[PDB]
Amino acid sequence: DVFRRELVDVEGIPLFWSIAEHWSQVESFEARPDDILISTYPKSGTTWVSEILDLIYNNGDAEKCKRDAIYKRVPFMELIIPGITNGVEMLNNMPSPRIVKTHLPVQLLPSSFWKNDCKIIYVARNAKDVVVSYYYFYQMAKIHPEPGTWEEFLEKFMAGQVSFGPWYDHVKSWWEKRKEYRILYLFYEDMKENPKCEIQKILKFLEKDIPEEILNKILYHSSFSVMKENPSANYTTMMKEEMDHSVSPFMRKGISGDWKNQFTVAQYEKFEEDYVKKMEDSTLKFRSE
Ligand SMILES: Nc1ncnc2c1ncn2[C@@H]1O[C@H](COP(=O)(O)OS(=O)(=O)O)[C@@H](OP(=O)(O)O)[C@H]1O
Ligand SMILES: O=[N+]([O-])c1ccc(OS(=O)(=O)O)cc1
């Protein structure tokens, strides 16, 4: 049973057993200078930005972006599950320009990305919304250990005892890294508020100037309501064994502020107190609504 196993520490970070088992393949991953790395803590907007990038790369052509599922168009690099997927191999076999997905904390990112000075788009999302999204994701995405109850999971998340480790360290270290490498550090909440502005930021970062009509096309097709229904983007093409959308759909709510629906007031206060301690010595700033 490849699913529901305990995570395995990889250089200090809990990862899926099969990622840990194939860690050398990941560590030695060969990046390319024109790779665009989409780097996120899980549930932070990876798919949204991946779709955007793929739409950009295909000039807003919806059909072209339906050539395959997002997880094939934008491979999850470190995700290696025997018999199921190998992000490294999928990427190795992908023509440039590659869009590369990762959730690795910065200290675990394969050094080739640094050596190739790749452009990286990091997406951060407020921790409270992340943990809620992650909770449901843990439930539906069977490669994860059992999340436990929301309460248990919340505690694991705060303790960083979740797949890919602590969100806090993830976002903070990636934020710090933006001083060393070309990281367009985006916030899920900003994409919610003004996706056009954020996509323009992506375009600028990518050094692409496209017609307003194409930008509007990209905006339309990267909206949650379009993506949710889009089988090439919404993970419903996943084997049910890997992702059971009947448990929780991948495209779950796609809002900011869902944490309000999940957190008890006590859990929220506790979370915030803990959060402040973990975050106050970082200049990184978020919105939760
Ligand atoms: N287009 C668009 N607009 C708004 N929100 C979107 C979009 N696409 C994905 N989502 C929401 O992002 C959450 C999934 O995050 P990721 O794509 O990072 O998940 S993953 O780590 O790649 O598995 C998950 O968030 P929650 O809905 O809060 O669970 C998705 O619904
Ligand atoms: O390609 N896959 O098989 C795949 C891709 C993503 C994915 O997400 S995960 O967090 O459940 O590993 C799971 C399986």
Tab-separated table of C-alpha atoms and ligand atoms in Angstrom:
chain	number	residue	atom	x	y	z
A	1	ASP	CA	0.000	0.000	0.000
A	2	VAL	CA	1.778	3.171	-1.272
A	3	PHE	CA	-0.853	5.334	0.426
A	4	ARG	CA	-1.345	6.576	3.983
A	5	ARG	CA	2.177	5.859	5.169
A	6	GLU	CA	4.055	7.824	7.777
A	7	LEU	CA	6.184	10.616	6.390
A	8	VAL	CA	9.908	10.126	6.254
A	9	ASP	CA	12.345	12.845	7.359
A	10	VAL	CA	14.491	14.112	4.505
A	11	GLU	CA	17.174	16.509	5.720
A	12	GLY	CA	14.896	17.574	8.521
A	13	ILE	CA	11.616	17.748	6.568
A	14	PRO	CA	8.835	15.186	6.567
A	15	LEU	CA	8.282	13.984	3.035
A	16	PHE	CA	6.341	11.186	1.448
A	17	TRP	CA	8.096	7.911	1.965
A	18	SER	CA	8.622	7.492	-1.774
A	19	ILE	CA	10.130	10.954	-2.185
A	20	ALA	CA	12.537	10.159	0.648
A	21	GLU	CA	13.289	6.796	-0.917
A	22	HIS	CA	14.110	8.503	-4.209
A	23	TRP	CA	15.681	11.557	-2.675
A	24	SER	CA	18.934	11.276	-4.602
A	25	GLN	CA	16.947	11.516	-7.867
A	26	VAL	CA	15.388	14.695	-6.612
A	27	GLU	CA	18.579	16.187	-5.085
A	28	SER	CA	20.375	15.631	-8.407
A	29	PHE	CA	17.542	17.012	-10.495
A	30	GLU	CA	18.851	18.820	-13.520
A	31	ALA	CA	17.233	22.201	-13.904
A	32	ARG	CA	17.562	24.283	-17.079
A	33	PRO	CA	18.131	28.048	-17.264
A	34	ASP	CA	14.701	28.729	-18.739
A	35	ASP	CA	12.806	26.486	-16.340
A	36	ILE	CA	10.167	28.411	-14.511
A	37	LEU	CA	9.903	26.947	-11.044
A	38	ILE	CA	6.580	27.354	-9.349
A	39	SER	CA	7.370	26.892	-5.718
A	40	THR	CA	4.749	26.800	-3.041
A	41	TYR	CA	3.992	25.392	0.302
A	42	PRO	CA	1.236	22.877	-0.407
A	43	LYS	CA	-2.224	24.413	-1.025
A	44	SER	CA	-0.879	27.877	-1.624
A	45	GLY	CA	-1.955	28.361	-5.225
A	46	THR	CA	0.358	26.092	-7.114
A	47	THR	CA	-2.251	24.836	-9.595
A	48	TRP	CA	-3.648	28.287	-10.142
A	49	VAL	CA	-0.263	29.695	-11.033
A	50	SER	CA	0.655	26.594	-13.052
A	51	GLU	CA	-2.491	27.047	-15.169
A	52	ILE	CA	-1.723	30.746	-15.542
A	53	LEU	CA	1.805	29.967	-16.652
A	54	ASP	CA	0.612	27.347	-19.071
A	55	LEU	CA	-2.034	29.718	-20.477
A	56	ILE	CA	0.682	32.386	-20.824
A	57	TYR	CA	2.958	29.909	-22.592
A	58	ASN	CA	0.078	29.023	-24.928
A	59	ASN	CA	-1.094	32.583	-25.478
A	60	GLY	CA	-4.414	32.025	-23.735
A	61	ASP	CA	-5.291	29.048	-25.935
A	62	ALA	CA	-7.709	27.036	-23.782
A	63	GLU	CA	-7.594	23.978	-26.065
A	64	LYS	CA	-3.809	23.851	-26.006
A	65	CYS	CA	-3.936	23.991	-22.205
A	66	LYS	CA	-6.231	20.967	-22.373
A	67	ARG	CA	-3.587	18.831	-24.109
A	68	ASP	CA	-3.158	17.147	-20.724
A	69	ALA	CA	-3.869	17.377	-17.011
A	70	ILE	CA	-2.060	20.152	-15.161
A	71	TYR	CA	0.008	17.639	-13.197
A	72	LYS	CA	1.483	16.434	-16.499
A	73	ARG	CA	1.744	19.892	-18.104
A	74	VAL	CA	3.424	21.208	-14.985
A	75	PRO	CA	5.161	18.240	-13.300
A	76	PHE	CA	5.470	18.100	-9.507
A	77	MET	CA	9.223	17.562	-9.546
A	78	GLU	CA	9.936	15.749	-6.310
A	79	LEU	CA	6.788	13.698	-6.391
A	80	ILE	CA	7.948	10.185	-7.100
A	81	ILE	CA	5.618	7.367	-6.252
A	82	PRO	CA	6.583	3.982	-7.623
A	83	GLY	CA	4.086	2.678	-10.138
A	84	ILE	CA	2.297	6.017	-10.236
A	85	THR	CA	4.405	9.028	-11.094
A	86	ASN	CA	7.904	10.348	-11.249
A	87	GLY	CA	8.115	14.114	-11.471
A	88	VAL	CA	11.856	14.048	-12.100
A	89	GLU	CA	11.497	11.674	-15.016
A	90	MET	CA	8.511	13.564	-16.441
A	91	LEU	CA	10.531	16.755	-16.313
A	92	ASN	CA	13.661	15.105	-17.714
A	93	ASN	CA	11.550	14.169	-20.759
A	94	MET	CA	9.830	17.520	-21.125
A	95	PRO	CA	10.903	20.023	-23.769
A	96	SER	CA	11.865	23.500	-22.642
A	97	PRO	CA	10.552	25.906	-21.641
A	98	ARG	CA	9.525	23.771	-18.665
A	99	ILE	CA	7.148	24.800	-15.963
A	100	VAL	CA	8.221	22.995	-12.824
A	101	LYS	CA	6.182	22.550	-9.702
A	102	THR	CA	7.711	22.031	-6.320
A	103	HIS	CA	6.755	22.181	-2.685
A	104	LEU	CA	10.266	21.772	-1.379
A	105	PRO	CA	11.472	24.071	1.357
A	106	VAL	CA	14.233	26.175	0.032
A	107	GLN	CA	17.002	24.238	1.778
A	108	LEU	CA	15.853	21.057	0.061
A	109	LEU	CA	15.458	22.496	-3.408
A	110	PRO	CA	17.749	20.680	-5.823
A	111	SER	CA	20.838	22.856	-6.101
A	112	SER	CA	20.617	22.845	-9.925
A	113	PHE	CA	17.910	25.477	-9.714
A	114	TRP	CA	20.291	27.806	-7.896
A	115	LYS	CA	23.168	26.900	-10.227
A	116	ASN	CA	20.925	27.626	-13.242
A	117	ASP	CA	19.669	30.808	-11.581
A	118	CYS	CA	16.141	29.824	-12.634
A	119	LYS	CA	13.290	32.241	-12.318
A	120	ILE	CA	11.063	31.005	-9.565
A	121	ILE	CA	7.548	32.045	-8.849
A	122	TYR	CA	6.840	31.476	-5.213
A	123	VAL	CA	3.246	31.555	-4.050
A	124	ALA	CA	2.483	32.068	-0.396
A	125	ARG	CA	-0.957	31.875	1.056
A	126	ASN	CA	-2.019	32.817	4.516
A	127	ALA	CA	-1.229	29.983	6.885
A	128	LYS	CA	-4.756	29.626	8.240
A	129	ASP	CA	-6.245	29.092	4.784
A	130	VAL	CA	-3.369	26.798	3.919
A	131	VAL	CA	-3.853	24.527	6.894
A	132	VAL	CA	-7.574	24.222	6.152
A	133	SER	CA	-6.909	23.493	2.482
A	134	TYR	CA	-4.184	21.070	3.496
A	135	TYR	CA	-6.420	19.333	5.941
A	136	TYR	CA	-8.978	18.510	3.235
A	137	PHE	CA	-6.222	17.720	0.851
A	138	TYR	CA	-4.699	15.231	3.334
A	139	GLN	CA	-8.099	13.584	3.446
A	140	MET	CA	-8.574	13.297	-0.313
A	141	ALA	CA	-4.974	12.852	-1.410
A	142	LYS	CA	-4.220	9.371	-0.096
A	143	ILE	CA	-0.435	9.542	-0.385
A	144	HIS	CA	-0.565	11.638	2.824
A	145	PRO	CA	-0.660	10.045	6.246
A	146	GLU	CA	-4.086	10.148	7.857
A	147	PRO	CA	-4.528	13.779	8.903
A	148	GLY	CA	-6.439	12.801	12.029
A	149	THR	CA	-9.120	15.147	13.244
A	150	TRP	CA	-8.964	18.802	12.243
A	151	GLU	CA	-7.683	19.495	15.733
A	152	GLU	CA	-4.898	16.918	15.471
A	153	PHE	CA	-3.993	18.095	12.015
A	154	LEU	CA	-3.956	21.716	13.076
A	155	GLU	CA	-1.500	20.777	15.810
A	156	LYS	CA	0.632	18.771	13.362
A	157	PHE	CA	0.615	21.724	10.968
A	158	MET	CA	1.645	24.164	13.709
A	159	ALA	CA	4.360	21.729	14.755
A	160	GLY	CA	5.466	21.404	11.111
A	161	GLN	CA	4.716	17.681	11.338
A	162	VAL	CA	3.084	17.643	7.934
A	163	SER	CA	4.236	16.788	4.448
A	164	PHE	CA	6.859	19.347	3.352
A	165	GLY	CA	7.394	20.538	6.889
A	166	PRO	CA	6.418	23.769	8.629
A	167	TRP	CA	4.640	26.359	6.558
A	168	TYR	CA	6.331	29.052	8.674
A	169	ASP	CA	9.869	28.063	7.802
A	170	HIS	CA	8.774	27.367	4.229
A	171	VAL	CA	7.389	30.811	3.478
A	172	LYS	CA	9.989	32.611	5.587
A	173	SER	CA	13.007	30.941	4.082
A	174	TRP	CA	11.655	31.313	0.571
A	175	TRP	CA	10.985	34.984	1.326
A	176	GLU	CA	14.586	35.389	2.533
A	177	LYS	CA	15.786	33.595	-0.564
A	178	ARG	CA	14.263	36.254	-2.806
A	179	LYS	CA	17.353	38.322	-1.930
A	180	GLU	CA	19.615	35.700	-3.539
A	181	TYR	CA	17.581	34.483	-6.523
A	182	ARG	CA	14.949	35.694	-8.954
A	183	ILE	CA	11.875	34.818	-7.018
A	184	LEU	CA	8.642	36.539	-7.816
A	185	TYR	CA	7.010	36.097	-4.470
A	186	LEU	CA	3.280	36.149	-4.938
A	187	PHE	CA	0.438	35.905	-2.510
A	188	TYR	CA	-2.595	33.841	-3.142
A	189	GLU	CA	-4.685	36.630	-1.563
A	190	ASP	CA	-3.421	39.168	-4.105
A	191	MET	CA	-4.318	36.812	-6.914
A	192	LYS	CA	-7.760	36.578	-5.375
A	193	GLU	CA	-8.104	40.330	-5.064
A	194	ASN	CA	-6.636	41.399	-8.372
A	195	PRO	CA	-5.681	38.468	-10.605
A	196	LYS	CA	-5.042	40.797	-13.526
A	197	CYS	CA	-2.452	42.716	-11.484
A	198	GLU	CA	-0.793	39.491	-10.393
A	199	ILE	CA	-0.770	38.010	-13.864
A	200	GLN	CA	0.757	41.286	-15.108
A	201	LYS	CA	3.417	40.844	-12.416
A	202	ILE	CA	4.019	37.320	-13.718
A	203	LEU	CA	4.192	38.604	-17.301
A	204	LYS	CA	6.659	41.337	-16.308
A	205	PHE	CA	8.731	38.824	-14.366
A	206	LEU	CA	8.676	36.514	-17.367
A	207	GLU	CA	9.563	39.442	-19.628
A	208	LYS	CA	6.489	38.835	-21.782
A	209	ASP	CA	4.267	41.573	-23.180
A	210	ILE	CA	0.977	40.197	-24.470
A	211	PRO	CA	-2.146	41.869	-25.881
A	212	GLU	CA	-4.787	42.939	-23.397
A	213	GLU	CA	-7.151	40.490	-25.161
A	214	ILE	CA	-4.841	37.578	-24.454
A	215	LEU	CA	-4.342	38.737	-20.841
A	216	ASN	CA	-8.125	38.779	-20.531
A	217	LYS	CA	-8.292	35.325	-22.047
A	218	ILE	CA	-5.748	34.083	-19.522
A	219	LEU	CA	-7.639	35.778	-16.720
A	220	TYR	CA	-10.886	34.189	-17.787
A	221	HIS	CA	-9.487	30.688	-18.111
A	222	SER	CA	-7.508	30.812	-14.880
A	223	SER	CA	-10.529	31.820	-12.824
A	224	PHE	CA	-11.569	29.346	-10.169
A	225	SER	CA	-15.002	28.846	-11.693
A	226	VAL	CA	-13.454	27.909	-15.040
A	227	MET	CA	-10.621	25.867	-13.531
A	228	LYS	CA	-12.879	24.024	-11.114
A	229	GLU	CA	-14.846	22.603	-14.038
A	230	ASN	CA	-11.843	22.073	-16.219
A	231	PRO	CA	-10.839	18.389	-16.137
A	232	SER	CA	-7.330	19.312	-17.337
A	233	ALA	CA	-6.894	21.560	-14.314
A	234	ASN	CA	-9.039	20.260	-11.468
A	235	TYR	CA	-7.300	16.920	-10.820
A	236	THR	CA	-10.464	14.901	-11.506
A	237	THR	CA	-8.403	12.882	-14.024
A	238	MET	CA	-6.410	11.577	-11.034
A	239	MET	CA	-6.835	7.921	-10.200
A	240	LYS	CA	-9.366	7.886	-7.345
A	241	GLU	CA	-6.834	5.801	-5.349
A	242	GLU	CA	-4.507	8.813	-5.329
A	243	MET	CA	-7.162	11.510	-5.080
A	244	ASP	CA	-10.720	10.912	-4.023
A	245	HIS	CA	-12.588	14.054	-5.036
A	246	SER	CA	-15.717	12.702	-3.348
A	247	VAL	CA	-13.847	13.163	-0.025
A	248	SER	CA	-12.892	16.724	-0.890
A	249	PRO	CA	-12.518	18.114	-4.383
A	250	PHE	CA	-9.102	19.450	-5.283
A	251	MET	CA	-10.735	22.685	-6.417
A	252	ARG	CA	-12.409	22.949	-3.085
A	253	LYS	CA	-13.544	26.520	-2.505
A	254	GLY	CA	-10.837	28.691	-4.026
A	255	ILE	CA	-11.513	31.617	-1.691
A	256	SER	CA	-9.508	33.476	0.897
A	257	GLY	CA	-10.828	33.360	4.453
A	258	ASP	CA	-12.131	29.792	4.537
A	259	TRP	CA	-10.120	29.399	7.719
A	260	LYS	CA	-13.030	31.201	9.436
A	261	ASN	CA	-15.204	28.188	8.604
A	262	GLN	CA	-12.744	25.701	10.072
A	263	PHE	CA	-10.965	27.265	13.000
A	264	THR	CA	-12.629	27.511	16.332
A	265	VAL	CA	-12.070	30.898	17.931
A	266	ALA	CA	-9.793	29.168	20.490
A	267	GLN	CA	-7.835	27.403	17.756
A	268	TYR	CA	-7.550	30.738	15.974
A	269	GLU	CA	-6.266	32.607	19.018
A	270	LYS	CA	-3.806	29.811	19.835
A	271	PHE	CA	-2.732	29.727	16.203
A	272	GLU	CA	-2.198	33.474	16.059
A	273	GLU	CA	-0.193	33.579	19.263
A	274	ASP	CA	1.996	30.798	17.938
A	275	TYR	CA	2.118	32.431	14.491
A	276	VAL	CA	3.273	35.776	15.840
A	277	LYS	CA	6.130	34.072	17.673
A	278	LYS	CA	7.138	32.138	14.570
A	279	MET	CA	6.754	35.059	12.172
A	280	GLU	CA	7.393	38.367	13.902
A	281	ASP	CA	11.126	38.334	13.074
A	282	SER	CA	10.350	38.056	9.332
A	283	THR	CA	9.388	41.059	7.195
A	284	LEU	CA	6.992	38.775	5.372
A	285	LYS	CA	3.388	40.040	5.656
A	286	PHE	CA	0.085	38.323	4.839
A	287	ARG	CA	-3.633	38.953	4.760
A	288	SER	CA	-6.085	36.287	5.964
A	289	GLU	CA	-9.176	37.801	4.273
B	1	LIG	N1	-8.026	29.415	-10.145
B	1	LIG	C1	-8.064	29.384	-8.799
B	1	LIG	N2	-8.520	30.450	-8.077
B	1	LIG	C2	-8.578	30.422	-6.734
B	1	LIG	N3	-8.155	29.368	-6.019
B	1	LIG	C3	-7.678	28.251	-6.628
B	1	LIG	C4	-7.587	28.195	-8.084
B	1	LIG	N4	-7.094	26.999	-8.418
B	1	LIG	C5	-6.859	26.334	-7.261
B	1	LIG	N5	-7.226	27.089	-6.206
B	1	LIG	C6	-7.156	26.730	-4.787
B	1	LIG	O1	-5.819	26.447	-4.409
B	1	LIG	C7	-5.836	25.361	-3.480
B	1	LIG	C8	-5.044	24.224	-4.078
B	1	LIG	O2	-3.764	24.772	-3.860
B	1	LIG	P1	-2.539	24.201	-4.694
B	1	LIG	O3	-2.992	24.311	-6.125
B	1	LIG	O4	-1.281	24.864	-4.177
B	1	LIG	O5	-2.527	22.708	-4.152
B	1	LIG	S1	-1.174	21.835	-4.300
B	1	LIG	O6	-0.209	22.073	-3.225
B	1	LIG	O7	-0.626	22.069	-5.652
B	1	LIG	O8	-1.662	20.434	-4.178
B	1	LIG	C9	-7.283	24.994	-3.241
B	1	LIG	O9	-7.673	25.891	-2.217
B	1	LIG	P2	-8.900	25.535	-1.244
B	1	LIG	O10	-10.097	25.680	-2.164
B	1	LIG	O11	-8.844	26.609	-0.192
B	1	LIG	O12	-8.686	24.127	-0.754
B	1	LIG	C10	-7.899	25.422	-4.547
B	1	LIG	O13	-9.323	25.568	-4.469
B	2	LIG	O1	0.808	12.695	-10.795
B	2	LIG	N1	0.382	12.193	-9.766
B	2	LIG	O2	0.148	10.997	-9.727
B	2	LIG	C1	0.152	12.995	-8.638
B	2	LIG	C2	0.324	14.382	-8.732
B	2	LIG	C3	0.092	15.183	-7.619
B	2	LIG	C4	-0.306	14.597	-6.418
B	2	LIG	O3	-0.521	15.400	-5.327
B	2	LIG	S1	-0.149	14.797	-3.852
B	2	LIG	O4	0.082	15.901	-2.903
B	2	LIG	O5	-1.271	13.916	-3.461
B	2	LIG	O6	1.089	13.989	-3.962
B	2	LIG	C5	-0.484	13.212	-6.323
B	2	LIG	C6	-0.252	12.405	-7.434
